[PDB]
Design a binder for this molecule. Structure first.
Ligand SMILES: Cc1cn([C@H]2C[C@H](O)[C@@H](COP(=O)(O)OP(=O)(O)OP(=O)(O)O)O2)c(=O)[nH]c1=O
Ligand code: SF4
Ligand SMILES: [Zn+2]
Lengths: 66, 249, 763, 251
DNA sequence: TTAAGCAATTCGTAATCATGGTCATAG
DNA sequence: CTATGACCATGATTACGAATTGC
């Protein structure tokens, strides 16, 4: 923790995985894996050792009335 | 077609003066089980729940489940054109949006009014039944004076239910004070306790809740952990009237 | 400070020549601009100071650079110990400093600004130019860019990310830094500033700091050296007021026979010109005596003074006024040959400025707190004004009469201190125009020169409500059929109200004056009130704005906007309204009826926290009384009952801590009877179900069509079709109108799942 | 440690109801003789002397010559929260600058315990003269209030003529002149005008309305006057002590 | 040391004044 | 157990300041 919260914030702004501020984080991870762009096997291995926490399993701007 | 007839119009006038300040619009759910109502206040803080059971109306007739939309100010103005001894009948169609009220004096004078209803798009809410753990049954006059007397000091009040009795405290810029009450027919204060309670509620809502004091002699206060305080009144072989208010955090 | 972005041009060339952007992390290249990157902020501030020394600009502009940008840079350079930053000026050994200043007048109000010292260079913040010249509703860059052209915590994670995010941030910053240049060259700011400095004789820094006194002092001194006079110093605290202008009593109502308007042009400067009034020719009460020559040596005014004829002296204020009048005449002669509309109004702005200068020459005399007051002159001016307008009204109503061979004796319906609205009688606009031109040219031959009356318009029909409140339709020629409406004073040009009310007043006067159909007007006002009560009106139409003036007058009595401003937020005690700006608010519903200052809230706070709206406040306090002003004079008091009955057929249709403890009782779609089970239809209203499904799928169909037109408009206003939209612009109707249709669709989609599915889905 | 009781305690409600419209503050002098209050008015025309002996109380403990100050109308607003049959108890610590009021019930089931904070006082204090009052009148309080209120709807200031046979309450007004005459009546409803030498004086009738605020405060009202001196109206607080309102006369 | 004028209409808040519903106690 | 006016409570009228626009 506090290092796992920057890896996800770095996965969320890389443009080669998609334009993602409307959906979940694991849905975008599996969308890129289907098309197989290059999802890395570390943004998966922190979404498995946690429960349904809203500060891991949510996009950066999931507040913010946009 | 709906038609009811009730001999004690005074009960109707007391219930309509319970609510004309807290609520401006309501929907009456007319059924074959009685006349039942739920509403929120205008401030979106408190809940009212009113039940007039079907038996206590001394001449009942309801064909089909209705829903009437009533502006409570115009109805409260109409029900003060009827003295305290009259006999009140309600007449409604199942195709119309206009209600008829006929007041029958117990002596040569009969009166009849027609009032236009309105269509409203409100949503109906309710309550679930759980066991509140502090159960107070107290005189209504003492509760009215206690709320009205603490009101001049400050605006919150803390209710403190302990073993032998309950204790109400309130503060403000001109100081603070409490009132005790202890276990010792209707002038008694019966106190059932399993877990002790201490909670805080604002006074403007309580001074709204104590407007319906002529409906009964005693009042029932129910408390539990972190739930909305319930204020309950009973109307004799007619039904009941409940207000609901949430605690401060 | 993480990014600085700069645009530079030579004046006269239609594009810039320099385009630079300096960032603080490594970035990605932008076509058309240079990009440099640094790993520390000291290098960034040093690089900007060296660039600003080497390019060596004449003028520095921007938007809110005085009160935000330059003192932020100066304080940030002081904190990080960089010694060589604050030397931005032209003199090689001088450092710059922050210094407070205030300005106040009854014309622009009071404003408090900081200044930063730059010797040699000139500053033009475009915000201060807008706030001084223009009277608008919001003064944000988005609002004035829409009005003239047509358009913090997210940025901190666009900068802590990657370098294409930083490239997006730099393109945004460069568009921001480019908009005030376009506004400066499009609005003809600098050309008018240079012409003002050449006509008045004051420097170019005084037209951004001072008022209208230094210019008239300057012109009077420049005219005083040519005859050898010296100015005295009189100072007095304080004299009394004098009597201002007359207004003629109306004949109120609705007119449908044409009224012609005749007025005097440049009234007070020509009074001061053609009766030889000046400081330097004011005759004291004794110095006429014991000489007895009254005839053609002096004159007498209605207030009582005596003033010397022009065969002895020429005053100084006639000559200054004559120069200003010729400059404005040349500006109008240039304006009479344009075809573009925005260019036509900016030349109108130039001539408006020269007429304001000529009238402030007269207003200099009566200012008892000033530098040289002579209230005798002011009283003589307004006495001559009153005498001449009552002369006009007597003459116009007296000559053209039934006994004098004409058709009908005319009757004046109105006059306000420079104009006369005479009602002639004919209903043909050609004959009214012909007689009105004859009347203007006839009456003008009873005066000295340059006193002239002129025809200006014909109103057909006309609507007179009170003093300083009327409306009409505008005729310039006859075969030029009609131009527009005129709304003098009414609820459509003031800024103290809601957009909903001003729009309703404009649409009612449109349907009532152009098409002459009161039934569509009643149906329109009914639909507005019905859609108000049914809770389908956007909150853009509900926002009220008020100006936060000096704090002691707002200490004297409790207001709504003062209460909202002085109540800080928990989020930000560092961004709040200051003195002089405008506070926006809406009124929410509560039970504290003694105080409308206890129900006011910020629009963004009621956005994010979802508080309800007081529809009865907006119904009886905002809407109702302007409508009763407008709709009554065409009919009787059965018209008040007609609109209050239009309301009455439509008032009976209203849409609706403890809120979490819901039960969510289902209800019959046909007859609204709460009941156990989830089926949509009631057992008595079960047959009629195909019609009840038919009804409401044409509502889902129309919500679907509104979702798509809005959420793809943001993609075209943003620029890109492949990346996310981030624009929470509070001055755009687009924002928060795109937020409620998601919830309407969320609700209307779930109401139709009460009905089963129209088929399987797992086959 | 001050701790005092009063069973028939409606009198405290009754005195502070007739105290708060006159003056905004009071200098409470607690001595071993009991509870006392000398205080001027706010308009520099009048004065209140309240004396409450210890023998008019029930149960008493005074260990200090306390000299405190009360803001009156907030104390009256607190005194409005207790009935008239209810027992009034006061408690005070000589270091803790507060007043602890204890309202007992006659049925003892409702207990009240209120607290008002203290504020400092440097109030002026002058002594009354003792002299001969040429007219002392014993009157019913209700009839006296009725008469002066009946005069309030004529004019503003009253002229009095005090003599042997009758007493003459005269006044002018915007509707003209009027006067009512009284005489002795040959225990509470009895009157007596004890007189040596007849006089005439001017007084303010509005201050008589202010003084008749203590109408239910005694058996009888006493009116004591002489030449060019403060009228003292007396309400004998039954078995307790007495309240005397001084009014400096007019010129 | 610094600042162009007057006329008029509209709306909100606190204070002033009118009037009825309870009530409290003397008959 | 029942008249009478004194007492509390709620609504109609006036006054004045603030804001903004027309000449
Ligand atoms: C607008 C305005 C008018 N006035 C006075 C002077 C003017 O002589 C008189 C008439 O007002 P305006 O008609 O507004 O101005 P104008 O008549 O001088 O010029 P034009 O007809 O070409 O528009 O009102 C002022 O003193 N100060 C002002 O700001
Ligand atoms: S909300 Fe959409 S349309 Fe409105 S300003 Fe923002 S991007 Fe443009
Ligand atoms: Zn049904």
């Amino acid at each position: 923790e506090e290092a796992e919260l920057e890896l996800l914030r770095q996965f969320d702004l890389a443009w080669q995985y998609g334009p993602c501020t409307g959906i979940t984080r694991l849905q975008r991870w599996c969308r890129a894996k289907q098309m197989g762009l290059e999802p890395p096997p570390e943004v998966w291995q922190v979404l498995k050792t946690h429960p349904g926490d809203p500060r891991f399993q949510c996009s950066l701007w999931h507040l913010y009335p946009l | 077609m709906f038609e009811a007839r009730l001999v004690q119009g005074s009960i109707l006038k007391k219930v309509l003066e319970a609510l004309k300040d807290l609520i401006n619009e309501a929907c009456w759910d007319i059924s074959s089980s009685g006349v039942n109502l739920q509403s929120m206040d205008s401030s979106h803080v408190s809940l009212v729940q009113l039940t007039l059971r079907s038996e206590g109306f001394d001449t009942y007739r309801c064909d089909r489940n209705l829903a009437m939309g009533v502006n409570l100010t115009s109805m409260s103005k109409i029900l003060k054109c009827a003295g305290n001894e009259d006999i009140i009948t309600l007449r409604a169609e199942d195709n119309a949006d206009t209600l008829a009220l006929v007041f029958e004096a117990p002596n040569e004078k009969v009166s009849d009014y027609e009032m236009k209803l309105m269509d409203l798009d409100v949503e109906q809410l309710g309550i679930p039944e759980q066991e509140y753990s502090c159960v107070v049954k107290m005189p209504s006059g003492e509760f009215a004076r206690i709320c009205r007397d603490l009101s001049h000091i400050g605006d919150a009040v803390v209710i403190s239910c302990a073993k032998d009795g309950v204790k109400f405290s309130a503060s403000g810029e001109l100081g603070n004070g409490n009132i005790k009450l202890s276990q010792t027919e209707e002038e008694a204060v019966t106190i059932e306790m399993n877990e002790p309670v201490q909670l805080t509620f604002a006074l403007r809502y309580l001074n709204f809740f104590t407007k319906a004091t002529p409906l009964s002699s005693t009042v029932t206060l129910s408390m539990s952990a972190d739930v909305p305080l319930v204020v309950e009144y009973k109307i004799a072989d007619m039904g009941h009237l409940k207000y609901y208010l949430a605690p401060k955090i | 400070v993480i990014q600085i972005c700069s645009l530079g041009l030579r004046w006269g060339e239609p594009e810039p020549f320099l385009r630079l952007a300096l960032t603080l992390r490594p970035c990605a290249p932008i076509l058309g601009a240079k990009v440099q990157s640094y790993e520390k902020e000291e290098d960034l501030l040093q690089a900007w100071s060296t660039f600003i020394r080497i390019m060596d600009p004449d003028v520095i502009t921007g938007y809110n650079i005085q009160n935000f940008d330059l003192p932020y840079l100066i304080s940030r350079a002081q904190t990080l110990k960089v010694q060589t930053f604050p030397f931005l000026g032209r003199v090689a050994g001088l450092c710059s400093n922050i210094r407070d200043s205030s300005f106040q007048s009854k014309q622009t109000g009071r404003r408090d600004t900081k200044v930063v010292s730059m010797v040699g260079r000139v500053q033009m913040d475009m915000l201060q130019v807008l706030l001084r010249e223009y009277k608008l509703r919001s003064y944000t860059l988005n609002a004035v860019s829409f009005h003239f052209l047509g358009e913090h915590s997210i940025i901190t994670d666009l900068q802590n990310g990657n370098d294409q995010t930083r490239r997006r941030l730099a393109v945004y910053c460069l568009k921001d830094a480019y908009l005030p240049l376009r506004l400066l060259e499009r609005l003809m700011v600098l050309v008018n500033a240079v012409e003002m400095a050449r006509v008045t004789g004051v420097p170019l820094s005084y037209l951004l700091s001072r008022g209208q006194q230094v210019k008239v002092v300057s012109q009077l001194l420049r005219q005083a050296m040519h005859e050898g006079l010296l100015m005295p110093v009189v100072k007095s605290e304080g004299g009394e007021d004098y009597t201002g202008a007359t207004v003629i009593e109306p004949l109120k109502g609705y007119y449908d026979v044409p009224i012609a308007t005749l007025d005097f042009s440049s009234l007070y400067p020509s009074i001061m010109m053609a009766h030889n009034l000046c400081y330097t020719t004011l005759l004291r009460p004794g110095t006429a005596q014991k000489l007895g020559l009254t005839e053609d040596q002096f004159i007498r005014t209605p207030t009582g003074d005596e003033f010397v004829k022009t065969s002895v002296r020429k005053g100084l204020l006639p000559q200054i006024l004559e120069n200003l009048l010729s400059a404005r005449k040349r500006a109008k002669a240039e304006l009479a040959k344009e075809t573009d509309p925005l260019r036509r109004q900016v030349l109108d702005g130039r001539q408006l400025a020269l007429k304001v200068s000529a009238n402030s020459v007269y207003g200099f005399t009566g200012a008892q707190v000033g530098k040289l007051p002579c209230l005798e002159i002011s009283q003589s001016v307004t006495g001559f004004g009153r005498q001449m307008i009552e002369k006009t009204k007597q003459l116009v109503e007296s000559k053209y009469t039934v006994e004098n061979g004409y058709s009908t004796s005319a009757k004046v319906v109105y006059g306000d201190t420079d104009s006369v609205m005479c009602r002639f009688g004919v209903s043909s606009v050609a004959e009214a125009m012909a007689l009105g031109r004859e009347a203007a040219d006839w009456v003008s031959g009873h005066f000295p020169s340059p006193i002239r009356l002129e025809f200006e318009k014909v109103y057909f029909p006309y609507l007179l409500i009170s003093k300083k409140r009327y409306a009409g339709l505008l005729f310039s020629s006859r075969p030029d059929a009609h131009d527009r409406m005129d709304c003098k004073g009414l609820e459509a040009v003031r800024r103290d109200n809601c957009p909903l009310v001003a729009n309703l007043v404009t649409a009612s006067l449109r349907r009532l004056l152009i098409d002459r159909d009161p039934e569509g007007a009643v149906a329109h006002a009914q639909d507005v009130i019905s859609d108000l009560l049914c809770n389908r009106i956007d909150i853009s139409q509900l926002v009220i704005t008020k100006e936060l003036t000096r704090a002691a007058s707002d200490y004297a009595g409790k207001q709504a906007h003062v209460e909202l401003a002085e109540r800080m937020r928990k989020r930000d005690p560092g961004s709040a309204p200051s003195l002089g700006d405008r506070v926006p608010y809406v009124i929410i519903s509560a039970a504290k009826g003694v105080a409308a200052y206890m129900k006011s809230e910020d629009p963004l706070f009621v956005l994010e926290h979802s508080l309800p709206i007081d529809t009865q406040y907006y119904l009886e306090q905002q809407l109702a009384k302007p409508l009763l002003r407008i709709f009554e004079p065409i009919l009787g008091e059965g018209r008040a009952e007609a609109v209050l009955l239009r309301g009455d057929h439509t008032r009976c249709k209203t849409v609706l801590g403890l809120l979490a403890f819901a039960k969510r009782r289902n209800c019959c779609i046909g007859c609204r009877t709460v009941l156990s089970h989830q089926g949509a239809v009631c057992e008595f209203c079960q047959p009629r179900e195909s019609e009840l499904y038919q009804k409401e799928v044409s509502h889902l169909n129309a919500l679907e069509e509104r979702f798509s037109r809005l959420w793809t408009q943001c993609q075209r206003c943003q620029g890109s079709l492949h990346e996310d939209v981030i624009c929470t612009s509070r001055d755009c109707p687009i924002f928060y109108m795109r937020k409620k249709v998601r919830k309407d669709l969320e609700d209307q989609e779930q109401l139709l799942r009460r009905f089963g599915p129209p088929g399987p889905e797992a086959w």
